[PDB]
Amino acid sequence: TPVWNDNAHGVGSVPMHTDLELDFSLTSSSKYTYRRKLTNPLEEAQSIDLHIEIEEQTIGVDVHALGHWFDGRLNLKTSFHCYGACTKYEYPWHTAKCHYERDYQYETSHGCNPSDCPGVGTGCTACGLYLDQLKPVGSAYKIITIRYSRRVCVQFGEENLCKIIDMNDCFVSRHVKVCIIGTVSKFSQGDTLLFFGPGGGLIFKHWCTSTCQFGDPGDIMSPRDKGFLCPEFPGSFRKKCNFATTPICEYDGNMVSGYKKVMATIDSFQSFNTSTMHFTDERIEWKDPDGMLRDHINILVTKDIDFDNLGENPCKIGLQTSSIEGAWGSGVGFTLTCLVSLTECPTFLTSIKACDKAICYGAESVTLTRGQNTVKVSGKGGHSGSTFRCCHGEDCSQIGLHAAAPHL
Amino acid sequence: TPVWNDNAHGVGSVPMHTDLELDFSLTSSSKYTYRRKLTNPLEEAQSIDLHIEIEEQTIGVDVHALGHWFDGRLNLKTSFHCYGACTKYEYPWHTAKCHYERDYQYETSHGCNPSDCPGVGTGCTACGLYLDQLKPVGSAYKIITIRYSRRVCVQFGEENLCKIIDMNDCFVSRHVKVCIIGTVSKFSQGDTLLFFGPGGGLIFKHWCTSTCQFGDPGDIMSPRDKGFLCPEFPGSFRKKCNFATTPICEYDGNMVSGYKKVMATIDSFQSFNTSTMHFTDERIEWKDPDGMLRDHINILVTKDIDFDNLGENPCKIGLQTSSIEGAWGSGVGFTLTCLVSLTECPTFLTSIKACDKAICYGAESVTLTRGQNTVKVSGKGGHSGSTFRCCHGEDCSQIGLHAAAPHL
Amino acid sequence: TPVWNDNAHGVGSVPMHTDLELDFSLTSSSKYTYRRKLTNPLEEAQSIDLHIEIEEQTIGVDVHALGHWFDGRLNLKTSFHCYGACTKYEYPWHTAKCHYERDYQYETSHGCNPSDCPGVGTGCTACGLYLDQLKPVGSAYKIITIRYSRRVCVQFGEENLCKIIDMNDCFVSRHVKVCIIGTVSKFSQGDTLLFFGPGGGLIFKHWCTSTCQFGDPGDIMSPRDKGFLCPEFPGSFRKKCNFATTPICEYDGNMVSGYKKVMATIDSFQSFNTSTMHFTDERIEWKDPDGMLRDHINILVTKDIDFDNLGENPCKIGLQTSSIEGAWGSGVGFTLTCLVSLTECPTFLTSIKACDKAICYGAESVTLTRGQNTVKVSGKGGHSGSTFRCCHGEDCSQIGLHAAAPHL
Ligand SMILES: *[C@@H]1O[C@H](CO[C@H]2O[C@@H](C)[C@@H](O)[C@@H](O)[C@@H]2O)[C@@H](O[C@@H]2O[C@H](CO)[C@@H](O)[C@H](O)[C@H]2NC(C)=O)[C@H](O)[C@H]1NC(C)=O
Ligand SMILES: *[C@@H]1O[C@H](CO[C@H]2O[C@@H](C)[C@@H](O)[C@@H](O)[C@@H]2O)[C@@H](O[C@@H]2O[C@H](CO)[C@@H](O)[C@H](O)[C@H]2NC(C)=O)[C@H](O)[C@H]1NC(C)=O
Ligand SMILES: *[C@@H]1O[C@H](CO[C@H]2O[C@@H](C)[C@@H](O)[C@@H](O)[C@@H]2O)[C@@H](O[C@@H]2O[C@H](CO)[C@@H](O)[C@H](O)[C@H]2NC(C)=O)[C@H](O)[C@H]1NC(C)=O
Ligand code: NA
C-alpha cells in the first residue's frame, strides 16, 4: 500500500553519515558565500569542491495599484437666481470633478432676497463645494500578498543548481540541504504602501476604502490617468440670510485635505526603505535594506552517501487548465480549475499550483487518484495580462487563463 | 541544590548516538507519513518498527460571536402637529428598532405652517430617520486568540503515542522528538471574521466597536435573535419651510448602508478559505487549505540509548481552583486563582494552566515552593458554559469555575 | 580573492565531532538552566564544567510617549448681544482650552430677538461648545519598534560569557552555540499602548492620529503637562428661535467622550500583562508573563575541536559619526552618516549600526572597501538625549549625534 507524498521538502539523514553542518543567523539584507574543499578523511586523494552562494532576501508583494493620491483645496461658492428651478441654471462648479451641491429651491423670502428679488417660495440658492488646486502627491498600492525569498546556488562537485527559496522552505539536493527559517512583521496584507517620489515609502494601515471622507488618508484618488474617486463631505451647509442681500452659503465640515492632515502628523506613520526595486503590473519586488532583520540558515552536507529525499516518488502528472473564476488585483481572489492526470501510482499526495512566468499565486494540497482529477486552486494577485497556468513543481500546463478585473 | 524545571520541552542528545533525523518544510495543509524498519547496523536480527503520522495544520480561534450584520434601507419621515408638545403624539417610526428623531417643538411660523395652522411658537414638527427592509447578510466573530497545531502520532516498537502539538512546541518521547516551527501572518487578534453563507469568509480589520456610524462595516448588528445595536446617524436634519405648506424634513448625512458600501469595494477586503470547520460556543476550528503556507518539521530518532528528557523531574503537584475574576468572550480576559501543592522537591519551575476539556486558555510560569502555593493564571476565551480548571501538564483539578459574561 | 563577511552569526561543525545538542521549545516567560560535567569518553581523567543560564524573554519597545488621554464632559453655552460684532464681546468658554465656537453675526430677527432687542441684521448670537470636568485616564505610547531577546550566559571550563541574544540571532563561542528562533504576534508597529494605572495595559489599533474627533480613542490628549490637542466636533449648531425670546444654541453631533465609548465596549479591546517594567525616555522594557508563548532553543556543544566561526575575519574597522538627519520618537526615523575605515582586507561585508548605551536603533549591511567609506544607517527610536554612535559589533565611535524632535 504505497502512499506517495511530495509535499515534504527536505531530507532523511543518518547523523553519523553527515560530514558538515552550517547553522547561523544571517542579516536579511546580506548575501553569504561558503567555499570549501571536502577532502576524504585522509586515506584518499579525491576532493570535492563545495560552493554555496546565498543572495540577499527579496520581498515580493502582489498589489493592487490604487493610482495617485491628491492634495487639493476645498472651495465654496454660491449661485442665486430669483426665479426658476435649480436645474434651469448651470453652476460654476459643474466642470469640477469633485463637487458637492446643496439646493435651496423655492425657498426665497423677504429677509433673504436681494433688493431686485420680490420672490417668495421661488427660484434657487445653490451652494457648491468643489476641490481645486489639485496636485498628485504619491502613488498608492494595496498589499494583497507578501512573500520573502533568497536565491540559493549550490555547487557540489560538477553538480550546480540555483533555486529561489521561499522563507520557510528548503533547497534539496542529493548532497546538500539548505533550509531558511524566518519571520518578518513589517508589512501586512491590506496595508497600503505610499510612494511619494521616484528609495522608500510609507505604510498606511487605515487608508480609506468603503468610506472616504475629505481629510482621510486616501481621500482624493485617481485610479488611472483621468477620473477621480471623490471623497464625501459629511458637514452641513447653511444659507446665511439678510434683508436686501444675496444669500451666502457656509459649510461647517472639515476643510483640510487628507494629505495636509497626514503631513501635519507625519511622524505617526511608518516609513520603509527599498533597494533595487522592480515595479511590474500589480507587483512590486525589492530588497529591504533594514539590517536589523535576520533569518536562520541551516546547511547540511553529506559527501558520500546520498540524502533520502523525503519527497521522492515515481508518480507522473499531466496538467491542463479547465476554467477560472474571480479576479486579479483583488483580496478576494480567483479560483483556477485544473484537470490533472496521475499515472504510475494509485494515489499521490502533492500540491497543484496556479502560476505564471515562474511566479506562484496559489496552491492546493490534494491526494490525486490514478487517472483524471479535477483540482481547484485558490489564488490571489496577478494582473490583466496574467495567464494563470496549472503547475506541479517546475512543470506547467501549455496555456493559462485570464482572471477578471476587480472593482467593476 | 536542585533547580527542577519542566518548561523545557525537548531533549539532550549525543549526535554520535543518534540514528535518524528528518528535517523538512511541509505544506501546512498536507499530512505526512513516515514508515521505516530500524535494523541493527548489521550484527543483529532485531528490527524496530517506526511509524510517524503528522496531520494537517489546524487553526483554533477563540472568538466572541457578534451576531448578525444586517443590510437595510434608511427612510425619512415627517410628522407635523399644529399644537401640543412632541411627546403628546405617537410617531410612525416608534416601532422601528433603529430610529433617530429630531423635534422642532414650539417653532411654528407663518411661512412654515400649513393653511389650517395659525400657530406661532406652538406644536411640533417631528423628523424621523428609521431603518427598514432589514436583512441579515452574515455572522461576525471577533478574534480573541489564534493558535495553530498539528496532531502527531508516533509508534516506536510497541510504544504508540498521539499528541496535539502546538506550532513552536515539541513532541517528546524516549526515542523520538518531533518539533514544529512556523509562523503565519494571516489572522490577527482583534480582526473580525465575517461568514456570508453556510467554505470561507472575509477578514475585516476595522469593524466598528466603540463608534458605529451608518455606513461602517458592522454598522447594524443584532448580537442575538432579537435586539439591534443601532448605528449613529451623524448628519443633520433640516426643516424645509414654505407658506401654507406642511414642513418637510431633510437629512444630509450618509444614506448608504455599510453592507452596500463594503460590497461596492469588496475587492479591498481579504478572503480566506476553510475546510472541515467546527463551530462551538465562542470557538471556531478549521483547516486552512491555503497550500502556499509551510511550516518546519524536525524529527530526531535514537534507537538504542534514550534521549535525555530536559523536563524530567521528580516533583509532584496537586491542584484546585480557588477563585476567578473577569470574563469569557473578552479581549481583556479572566484570571483564575489556583491553589497548588508541591511535594518531593524544594522548588519547581513549571507552568500552571487554565484549561477546560483539553483546551488551554492561559498559562503562568512559576517557581513553586514545597507545600502550598497560590498561582494566578491570566486567560482569554471560553464561553458561559466553560469551567476553567487549574492544570499541570495533562493533569487537572476536579472542578473548574465559570467566568462572567462580557459586554454587560 | 578573499571575500570576508561577518554577517553570518553561527558555526560550521562536523556532526561526528560534536558532543552534545540540546533542542527544545521553552516557555517564553521561563528561564532555563543546564549544568553538566563533560567527561572524556572514558580513557581520561579530565572533565569540563558546562553551565548555561538562559533568562526569560524580554520585550523592548521603542515608543513615542503621547502623554495622557482625558475623559471629559462636552458642554454647550449661548451668548447673545443685541448690537456689535462678535469679537467685540468676550465669551465664557474663552478660557476653555478645547472649545468650538459658531457665530450668528448680524442675523438678528423679529421672531428670534429677546423683548429688549429691536435689532435686525445686527449684533451676535454666539454658540459655544467646550470640554470641562477633564480628568486624565491613562498614559499612551505609540509603538515604533518591537524586539524580543533573552540574556544567555555560558560557562565552558574557565571561559564565561554573557550576551543579550535577540530572537532569531545566535550566541557564538569556540565550544558552544546557542540559537533562539521564535515569532510573536501580539504587538505591532503603530499600535498604541495605554496604561490606565501605576501590571498591564490595553492595545489600541486605531488610536486617532491625523483626524481626532470627539468620541475617538485618543480624542482628548495632553502631549505634556499643560496643553491639549483638542478633538474636532463634526456636528452642527442650530440657533433655536422664538418671538421675544433669547436665541438658544443646540449641537447635533456626538456628546459622549472617547473614554466613555471605549469603556462601554471595553471587552472589544486586547489587554496585555507586564512584569518588571522599566520605563525610560521613549522606551519601555518588560517581561511578558503570557505563559502560552514559546520560543525554540538550540544548543550545540563541541568539547575538543573548536567550531568554525562563520564570521571569523582579520578585517579591522575604525568608526566615527559624520552627520545625522531626521527625528527620534518617529515612525519615519533618522539617518546616521558614518565614516568607516577598513584595514587588513581589500573588502569586508559586515553591518554598521546606530547605537547608544548598548541599544541598537538601526543597521546597514555594507561591503566596505579598504580605506575610507561613507555609510548611511537608517534608524528609528531614541529620545532627545540620545547620542547615536556608529558601531561595529561591540565597538562604537567616541561620540554620537542627537536627532531632531518629532511633531514640530
Ligand atoms: C474558497 O473561497 C472562494 C471565494 O468565495 C467565497 O468568498 C467569501 C468572501 C465568502 O463570501 C464565501 O461565502 C464565498 O464562497 C470560493 O469561490 C466562490 O464560490 C462561489 C460558489 O460556487 C462562486 O459563486 C464564486 O464565484 C467563487 N469565487 C471565486 C473567486 O472563485 C471557493 O468555492 C472556496 N473554496 C475553494 C475550495 O476554493
Ligand atoms: C494582569 O492583568 C489583569 C487585567 O487587569 C488589567 O487590565 C488592563 C486593561 C489595565 O486596566 C490594568 O490596569 C488592569 O489591572 C489584572 O487583573 C485585574 O486586577 C485588578 C486589580 O486587582 C482587578 O480589579 C480586576 O478585576 C482584575 N481583572 C481580571 C480580569 O482579573 C491582573 O492583576 C494582572 N496581573 C496578573 C498577574 O494577572
Ligand atoms: C531611506 O529613507 C529615508 C526616509 O526618507 C524617505 O521617507 C519616505 C517617507 C518617503 O517620503 C521617501 O521619498 C523619503 O526619501 C531617506 O532619507 C531622506 O532622504 C531625503 C533625500 O536626501 C532627505 O531630504 C530627508 O531628510 C531624509 N530623511 C531622513 C530621515 O534621513 C533615505 O535617503 C532612504 N535611503 C537610505 C539609504 O537611508
Ligand atoms: Na451637520
Side-chain angles (χ1 to χ4, degrees):
Chain A
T1 152
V3 276
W4 296 110
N5 180 352
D6 74 351
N7 282 330
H9 294 175
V11 299
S13 60
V14 174
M16 336 173 191
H17 301 108
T18 70
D19 299 88
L20 182 68
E21 181 173 14
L22 319 183
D23 190 87
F24 58 101
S25 174
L26 183 58
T27 305
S28 299
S29 59
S30 184
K31 68 178 190 170
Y32 177 75
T33 302
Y34 189 81
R35 275 185 177 270
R36 194 183 180 92
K37 297 272 199 189
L38 307 177
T39 48
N40 285 237
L42 233 202
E43 305 305 89
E44 254 323 305
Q46 43 171 4
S47 65
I48 301 170
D49 293 313
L50 172 68
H51 181 207
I52 294 170
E53 299 276 2
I54 300 173
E55 301 180 27
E56 302 90 341
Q57 185 196 80
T58 302
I59 184 182
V61 195
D62 296 306
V63 299
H64 183 56
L66 298 170
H68 292 90
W69 191 27
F70 287 71
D71 189 19
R73 292 175 73 82
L74 189 56
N75 303 277
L76 180 52
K77 274 196 188 311
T78 304
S79 175
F80 175 86
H81 291 85
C82 305
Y83 302 99
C86 294
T87 52
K88 195 168 178 295
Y89 310 100
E90 196 177 32
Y91 305 123
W93 51 78
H94 77 270
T95 66
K97 295 323 175 188
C98 296
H99 66 264
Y100 171 45
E101 176 172 351
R102 156 119 119 183
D103 295 343
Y104 295 97
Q105 186 182 245
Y106 302 143
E107 296 185 35
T108 46
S109 42
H110 182 23
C112 195
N113 290 358
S115 65
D116 50 11
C117 185
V120 172
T122 63
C124 179
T125 294
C127 302
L129 278 179
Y130 64 96
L131 294 173
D132 217 334
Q133 218 184 52
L134 294 159
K135 174 180 293 176
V137 293
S139 296
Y141 303 82
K142 180 67 145 186
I143 296 187
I144 295 172
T145 72
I146 298 152
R147 308 201 187 282
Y148 290 89
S149 66
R150 293 179 179 265
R151 181 162 191 268
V152 171
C153 285
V154 176
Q155 175 180 6
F156 182 91
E158 63 186 11
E159 315 176 19
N160 187 21
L161 183 58
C162 296
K163 300 187 87 293
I164 294 163
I165 305 300
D166 298 325
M167 191 165 62
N168 302 320
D169 204 352
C170 297
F171 175 113
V172 177
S173 64
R174 290 189 309 272
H175 300 275
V176 183
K177 173 172 67 78
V178 186
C179 287
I180 303 170
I181 296 168
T183 179
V184 194
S185 288
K186 173 172 306 190
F187 303 101
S188 294
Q189 288 166 305
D191 285 352
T192 305
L193 303 178
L194 188 68
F195 296 87
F196 279 112
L202 290 174
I203 302 167
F204 288 87
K205 299 192 75 75
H206 315 92
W207 199 257
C208 67
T209 55
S210 52
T211 291
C212 283
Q213 299 179 334
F214 182 62
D216 291 344
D219 57 354
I220 306 159
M221 299 299 298
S222 176
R224 323 266 208 78
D225 181 32
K226 278 287 173 61
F228 293 94
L229 295 182
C230 298
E232 296 170 13
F233 302 104
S236 303
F237 289 103
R238 190 182 74 106
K239 186 180 60 171
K240 181 183 65 191
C241 289
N242 276 123
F243 275 91
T245 304
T246 303
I248 295 192
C249 299
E250 305 166 345
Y251 173 73
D252 68 10
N254 167 59
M255 303 285 301
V256 183
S257 70
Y259 174 75
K260 286 182 193 80
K261 290 175 142 275
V262 163
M263 292 302 297
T265 192
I266 194 61
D267 293 301
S268 301
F269 301 96
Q270 278 276 320
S271 65
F272 61 98
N273 283 83
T274 63
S275 71
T276 44
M277 190 149 47
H278 181 46
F279 288 83
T280 54
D281 291 337
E282 303 288 85
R283 193 166 161 94
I284 317 175
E285 288 173 6
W286 70 88
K287 291 174 168 185
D288 188 340
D290 185 347
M292 301 292 292
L293 300 168
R294 307 189 75 83
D295 63 357
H296 191 86
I297 311 290
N298 182 269
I299 295 170
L300 188 69
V301 180
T302 176
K303 169 169 56 186
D304 297 325
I305 308 181
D306 295 9
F307 285 135
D308 291 347
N309 185 335
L310 298 180
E312 185 172 297
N313 68 89
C315 310
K316 304 301 164 176
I317 288 170
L319 309 140
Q320 78 178 34
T321 64
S322 308
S323 64
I324 192 176
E325 57 176 323
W328 56 264
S330 165
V332 174
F334 61 88
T335 303
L336 181 68
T337 299
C338 308
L339 184 60
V340 181
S341 56
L342 172 67
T343 54
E344 310 307 318
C345 297
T347 67
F348 184 33
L349 172 52
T350 190
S351 292
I352 301 303
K353 306 175 289 187
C355 311
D356 201 27
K357 294 175 171 48
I359 302 306
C360 188
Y361 298 95
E364 175 76 4
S365 185
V366 51
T367 298
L368 298 174
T369 57
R370 194 193 305 273
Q372 296 288 351
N373 297 260
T374 294
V375 181
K376 296 198 178 298
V377 183
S378 293
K380 298 190 193 315
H383 56 101
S384 66
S386 298
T387 58
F388 302 107
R389 309 182 184 214
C390 299
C391 300
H392 174 259
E394 303 293 312
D395 304 320
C396 289
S397 57
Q398 291 283 297
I399 71 162
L401 306 170
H402 300 83
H407 292 287
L408 283 176
Chain B
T1 152
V3 276
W4 296 110
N5 180 352
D6 74 351
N7 282 330
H9 294 175
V11 299
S13 60
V14 174
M16 336 173 191
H17 301 108
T18 70
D19 299 88
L20 182 68
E21 181 173 14
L22 319 183
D23 190 87
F24 58 101
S25 174
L26 183 58
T27 305
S28 299
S29 59
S30 184
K31 68 178 190 170
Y32 177 75
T33 302
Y34 189 81
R35 275 185 177 270
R36 194 183 180 92
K37 297 272 199 189
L38 307 177
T39 48
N40 285 237
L42 233 202
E43 305 305 89
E44 254 323 305
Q46 43 171 4
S47 65
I48 301 170
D49 293 313
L50 172 68
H51 181 207
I52 294 170
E53 299 276 2
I54 300 173
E55 301 180 27
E56 302 90 341
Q57 185 196 80
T58 302
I59 184 182
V61 195
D62 296 306
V63 299
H64 183 56
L66 298 170
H68 292 90
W69 191 27
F70 287 71
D71 189 19
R73 292 175 73 82
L74 189 56
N75 303 277
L76 180 52
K77 274 196 188 311
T78 304
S79 175
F80 175 86
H81 291 85
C82 305
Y83 302 99
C86 294
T87 52
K88 195 168 178 295
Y89 310 100
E90 196 177 32
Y91 305 123
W93 51 78
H94 77 270
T95 66
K97 295 323 175 188
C98 296
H99 66 264
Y100 171 45
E101 176 172 351
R102 156 119 119 183
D103 295 343
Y104 295 97
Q105 186 182 245
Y106 302 143
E107 296 185 35
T108 46
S109 42
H110 182 23
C112 195
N113 290 358
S115 65
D116 50 11
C117 185
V120 172
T122 63
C124 179
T125 294
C127 302
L129 278 179
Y130 64 96
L131 294 173
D132 217 334
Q133 218 185 52
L134 294 159
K135 174 180 293 176
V137 293
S139 296
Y141 303 82
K142 180 67 145 186
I143 296 187
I144 295 172
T145 72
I146 298 152
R147 308 201 187 282
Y148 290 89
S149 66
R150 293 179 179 265
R151 181 162 191 268
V152 171
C153 285
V154 176
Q155 175 180 6
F156 182 91
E158 63 186 11
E159 315 176 19
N160 187 21
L161 183 58
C162 296
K163 300 187 87 293
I164 294 163
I165 305 300
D166 298 325
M167 191 165 62
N168 302 320
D169 204 352
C170 297
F171 175 113
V172 177
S173 64
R174 290 189 309 272
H175 300 275
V176 183
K177 173 172 67 78
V178 186
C179 287
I180 303 170
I181 296 168
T183 179
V184 194
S185 288
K186 173 172 306 190
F187 303 101
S188 294
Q189 288 166 305
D191 285 352
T192 305
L193 303 178
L194 188 68
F195 296 87
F196 279 112
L202 290 174
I203 302 167
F204 288 87
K205 299 192 75 75
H206 315 92
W207 199 257
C208 67
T209 55
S210 52
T211 291
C212 283
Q213 299 179 334
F214 182 62
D216 291 344
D219 57 354
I220 306 159
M221 299 299 298
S222 176
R224 323 266 208 78
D225 181 32
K226 278 287 173 61
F228 293 94
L229 296 182
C230 298
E232 296 170 13
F233 302 104
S236 303
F237 289 103
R238 190 182 74 106
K239 186 180 60 171
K240 181 183 65 191
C241 289
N242 276 123
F243 275 91
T245 304
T246 303
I248 295 192
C249 299
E250 305 166 345
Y251 173 73
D252 68 10
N254 167 59
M255 303 285 301
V256 183
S257 70
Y259 174 75
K260 286 182 193 80
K261 290 175 142 275
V262 163
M263 292 302 297
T265 192
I266 194 61
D267 293 301
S268 301
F269 301 96
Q270 278 276 320
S271 65
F272 61 98
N273 283 83
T274 63
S275 71
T276 44
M277 190 149 47
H278 181 46
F279 288 83
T280 54
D281 291 337
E282 303 288 85
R283 193 166 161 94
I284 317 175
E285 288 173 6
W286 70 88
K287 291 174 168 185
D288 188 340
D290 185 347
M292 301 292 292
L293 300 168
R294 307 189 75 83
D295 63 357
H296 191 86
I297 311 290
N298 182 269
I299 295 170
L300 188 69
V301 180
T302 176
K303 169 169 56 186
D304 297 325
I305 308 181
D306 295 9
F307 285 135
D308 291 347
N309 185 335
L310 298 180
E312 185 172 297
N313 68 89
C315 310
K316 304 301 164 176
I317 288 170
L319 309 140
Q320 78 178 34
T321 64
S322 308
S323 64
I324 192 176
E325 57 176 323
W328 56 264
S330 165
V332 174
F334 61 88
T335 303
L336 181 68
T337 299
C338 308
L339 184 60
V340 181
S341 56
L342 172 67
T343 54
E344 310 307 318
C345 297
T347 67
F348 184 33
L349 172 52
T350 190
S351 292
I352 301 303
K353 306 175 289 187
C355 311
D356 201 27
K357 294 175 171 48
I359 302 306
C360 188
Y361 298 95
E364 175 76 4
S365 185
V366 51
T367 298
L368 298 174
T369 57
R370 194 193 305 273
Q372 296 288 351
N373 297 260
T374 294
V375 181
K376 296 198 178 298
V377 183
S378 293
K380 298 190 193 315
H383 56 101
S384 66
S386 298
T387 58
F388 302 107
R389 309 182 184 214
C390 299
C391 300
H392 174 259
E394 303 293 312
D395 304 320
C396 289
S397 57
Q398 291 283 297
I399 71 162
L401 306 170
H402 300 83
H407 292 287
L408 283 176
Chain C
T1 152
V3 276
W4 296 110
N5 180 352
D6 74 351
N7 282 330
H9 294 175
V11 299
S13 60
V14 174
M16 336 173 191
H17 301 108
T18 70
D19 299 88
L20 182 68
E21 181 173 14
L22 319 183
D23 190 87
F24 58 101
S25 174
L26 183 58
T27 305
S28 299
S29 59
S30 184
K31 68 178 190 170
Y32 177 75
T33 302
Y34 189 81
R35 275 185 177 270
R36 194 183 180 92
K37 297 272 199 189
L38 307 177
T39 48
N40 285 237
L42 233 202
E43 305 305 89
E44 254 323 305
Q46 43 171 4
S47 65
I48 301 170
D49 293 313
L50 172 68
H51 181 207
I52 294 170
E53 299 276 2
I54 300 173
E55 301 180 27
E56 302 90 341
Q57 185 196 80
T58 302
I59 184 182
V61 195
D62 296 306
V63 299
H64 183 56
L66 298 170
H68 292 90
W69 191 27
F70 287 71
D71 189 19
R73 292 175 73 82
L74 189 56
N75 303 277
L76 180 52
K77 274 196 188 311
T78 304
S79 175
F80 175 86
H81 291 85
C82 305
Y83 302 99
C86 294
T87 52
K88 195 168 178 295
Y89 310 100
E90 196 177 32
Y91 305 123
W93 51 78
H94 77 270
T95 66
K97 295 323 175 188
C98 296
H99 66 264
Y100 171 45
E101 176 172 351
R102 156 119 119 183
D103 295 343
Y104 295 97
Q105 186 182 245
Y106 302 143
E107 296 185 35
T108 46
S109 42
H110 182 23
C112 195
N113 290 358
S115 65
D116 50 11
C117 185
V120 172
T122 63
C124 179
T125 294
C127 302
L129 278 179
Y130 64 96
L131 294 173
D132 217 334
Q133 218 185 52
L134 294 159
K135 174 180 293 176
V137 293
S139 296
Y141 303 82
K142 180 67 145 186
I143 296 187
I144 295 172
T145 72
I146 298 152
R147 308 201 187 282
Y148 290 89
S149 66
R150 293 179 179 265
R151 181 162 191 268
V152 171
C153 285
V154 176
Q155 175 180 6
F156 182 91
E158 63 186 11
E159 315 176 19
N160 187 21
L161 183 58
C162 296
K163 300 187 87 293
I164 294 163
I165 305 300
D166 298 325
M167 191 165 62
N168 302 320
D169 204 352
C170 297
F171 175 113
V172 177
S173 64
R174 290 189 309 272
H175 300 275
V176 183
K177 173 172 67 78
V178 186
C179 287
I180 303 170
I181 296 168
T183 179
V184 194
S185 288
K186 173 172 306 190
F187 303 101
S188 294
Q189 288 166 305
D191 285 352
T192 305
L193 303 178
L194 188 68
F195 296 87
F196 279 112
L202 290 174
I203 302 167
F204 288 87
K205 299 192 75 75
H206 315 92
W207 199 257
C208 67
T209 55
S210 52
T211 291
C212 283
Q213 299 179 334
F214 182 62
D216 291 344
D219 57 354
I220 306 159
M221 299 299 298
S222 176
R224 323 266 208 78
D225 181 32
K226 278 287 173 61
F228 293 94
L229 296 182
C230 298
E232 296 170 13
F233 302 104
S236 303
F237 289 103
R238 190 182 74 106
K239 186 180 60 171
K240 181 183 65 191
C241 289
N242 276 123
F243 275 91
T245 304
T246 303
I248 295 192
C249 299
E250 305 166 345
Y251 173 73
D252 68 10
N254 167 59
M255 303 285 301
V256 183
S257 70
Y259 174 75
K260 286 182 193 80
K261 290 175 142 275
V262 163
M263 292 302 297
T265 192
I266 194 61
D267 293 301
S268 301
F269 301 96
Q270 278 276 320
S271 65
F272 61 98
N273 283 83
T274 63
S275 71
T276 44
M277 190 149 47
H278 181 46
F279 288 83
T280 54
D281 291 337
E282 303 288 85
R283 193 166 161 94
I284 317 175
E285 288 173 6
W286 70 88
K287 291 174 168 185
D288 188 340
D290 185 347
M292 301 292 292
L293 300 168
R294 307 189 75 83
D295 63 357
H296 191 86
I297 311 290
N298 182 269
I299 295 170
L300 188 69
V301 180
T302 176
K303 169 169 56 186
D304 297 325
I305 308 181
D306 295 9
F307 285 135
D308 291 347
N309 185 335
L310 298 180
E312 185 172 297
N313 68 89
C315 310
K316 304 301 164 176
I317 288 170
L319 309 140
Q320 78 178 34
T321 64
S322 308
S323 64
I324 192 176
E325 57 176 323
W328 56 264
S330 165
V332 174
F334 61 88
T335 303
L336 181 68
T337 299
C338 308
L339 184 60
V340 181
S341 56
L342 172 67
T343 54
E344 310 307 318
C345 297
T347 67
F348 184 33
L349 172 52
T350 190
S351 292
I352 301 303
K353 306 175 289 187
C355 311
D356 201 27
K357 294 175 171 48
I359 302 306
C360 188
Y361 298 95
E364 175 76 4
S365 185
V366 51
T367 298
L368 298 174
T369 57
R370 194 193 305 273
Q372 296 288 351
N373 297 260
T374 294
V375 181
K376 296 198 178 298
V377 183
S378 293
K380 298 190 193 315
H383 56 101
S384 66
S386 298
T387 58
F388 302 107
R389 309 182 184 214
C390 299
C391 300
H392 174 259
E394 303 293 312
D395 304 320
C396 289
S397 57
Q398 291 283 297
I399 71 162
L401 306 170
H402 300 83
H407 292 287
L408 283 176

